[PDB]
């Protein structure tokens, strides 16, 4: 389980919101770690998987598995808080500096994006 | 197999009905009948060996089985007022249960707040 990874994910969000780090270089690292974490959590699965899980829950006929959905929910809560704060930081940042760090931050924004889509 | 888990779930449910709504004594009797939780001696560990084996449906339910036990066990064993009073049992039961809980906390949600109910 990438539970241990979860803690790093939290630290990353913390640093970003704080926007400490004179270096965007630092923030690029934070963005990269977050990107992998978001991607890692949902191994490529598509709506079919979600539908199957819901049915199984169907209702807990017996013992269901709803592990991946639960993991996504926890990620999304953490992310929310930290989120408003950090969204501000991530976008402004965007522009400038780092045309570089950019490659990293835009990718982070897009992954995040699916999840927390909605 | 399918039916067996079914009955177990029903038994656990009847335990719920009677848990609260009083009937402390009855709850212990039924829980023991389940043969899930070590009432006897330090056989708590055998309860470990038979734990991982447990079906997914039950493996999940144990958390409440414990703490239900330490509750009734607590309330029933409210220190009495002023003769045969074997407090010792319904005490040993908590002990075995705690060793049990101690062994599988990691494979449990993460509420060994059995401890709060355990003491007073």
Curated annotation (Swiss-Prot), chain A:
Subcellular location: Nucleus membrane; Nucleus, Nuclear pore complex
Tissue expression summary: Expressed in the testis.
Record text on subunit structure and interactions: Part of the nuclear pore complex (NPC). Forms a complex with NUP35, NUP93, NUP155 and lamin B. Does not interact with TPR. Interacts with TMEM209 and MYC.
Associated disorder: Nephrotic syndrome 13: A form of nephrotic syndrome, a renal disease clinically characterized by severe proteinuria, resulting in complications such as hypoalbuminemia, hyperlipidemia and edema. Kidney biopsies show non-specific histologic changes such as focal segmental glomerulosclerosis and diffuse mesangial proliferation. Some affected individuals have an inherited steroid-resistant form and progress to end-stage renal failure.
Family the entry assigns: Belongs to the NUP186/NUP192/NUP205 family.
Function: Plays a role in the nuclear pore complex (NPC) assembly and/or maintenance. May anchor NUP62 and other nucleoporins, but not NUP153 and TPR, to the NPC. In association with TMEM209, may be involved in nuclear transport of various nuclear proteins in addition to MYC.
The protein, known as: Nuclear pore complex protein Nup205
Entire protein: shown range: 1392 to 1509 of 2012
UniProtKB/Swiss-Prot annotation, chain B:
Function text: Plays a role in the nuclear pore complex (NPC) assembly and/or maintenance. May anchor nucleoporins, but not NUP153 and TPR, to the NPC. During renal development, regulates podocyte migration and proliferation through SMAD4 signaling.
Species, as recorded: Homo sapiens
The protein's name in its UniProt record: Nuclear pore complex protein Nup93
Lineage: Eukaryota, Metazoa, Chordata, Craniata, Vertebrata
Assigned protein family: Belongs to the nucleoporin interacting component (NIC) family.
Locations listed in the record: Nucleus membrane; Nucleus, Nuclear pore complex; Nucleus envelope
Disorder this protein is connected to according to its UniProt record: Nephrotic syndrome 12: A form of nephrotic syndrome, a renal disease clinically characterized by severe proteinuria, resulting in complications such as hypoalbuminemia, hyperlipidemia and edema. Kidney biopsies show non-specific histologic changes such as focal segmental glomerulosclerosis and diffuse mesangial proliferation. Some affected individuals have an inherited steroid-resistant form and progress to end-stage renal failure. NPHS12 inheritance is autosomal recessive.
Subunit description: Part of the nuclear pore complex (NPC). Component of the p62 complex, a complex composed of NUP62 and NUP54. Forms a complex with NUP35, NUP155, NUP205 and lamin B; the interaction with NUP35 is direct. Does not interact with TPR. Interacts with SMAD4 and IPO7; translocates SMAD4 to the nucleus through the NPC upon BMP7 stimulation resulting in activation of SMAD4 signaling.
